[PDB]
Subunit: 85 residues, 2 copies
């Protein structure tokens, strides 16, 4: 709504962007390695410019974020990336 | 720099957190007072009904304070997005 603060609008956008990529393949609510690499390469071109230059590094970031090591990133796991920057 | 919409969002969540966390005590964390102010001013819609009861807002924080030190680190705070 118009009443939505900037924090609220930005939270909604992060949620939508996560699901925009997580719905693509496999389970709709999580990012497998390919979905994560695509989000990182297309939408974190700047915040992860260095890392993006070594696929193995991105894979390593995913393993760090994948708390329960089920090879999938849930929303709660993925957002921790924000705190790692 | 052509920051993506995602990077802008993240910048905004980091700036807002820090806008409130620098106000009292430790600059890097939100205490109960800073958290209440952040919710009162910037989560008026997402937490409209809860904002009517500051005891509810205090419970929300206890819930987010994983290591129970009465301070919310950025990592603890952002989990709120998951509770929506
Ligand atoms: C209803 C809202 C989320 C609303 C939301 O999604 N706003 C966007 C609009 C859609 C959610 C976000 C955090 C939740 C609270 C905390 O967990 C603490 C505590 C845990 C207990 O077990 C039950 C009571 C209480 C106060 C919980 C209540 C309620 O559940 C809350 C306020
Ligand atoms: Ca998926
Ligand atoms: Ca996982
Ligand atoms: Ca503080
Ligand atoms: Ca804490």
């Amino acid at each position: 709504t118009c009443k939505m603060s900037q924090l609220e609008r930005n939270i909604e956008t992060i949620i939508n962007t996560f699901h925009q990529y997580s719905v693509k393949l496999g389970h709709p609510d999580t990012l497998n390695q390919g979905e994560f690499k695509e989000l990182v390469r297309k939408d974190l071109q700047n915040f992860l410019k260095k890392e993006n230059k070594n696929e193995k590094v991105i894979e390593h970031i995913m393993e760090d974020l994948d708390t329960n090591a089920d090879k999938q990133l849930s929303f709660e796991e993925f957002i921790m990336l924000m705190a790692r920057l």
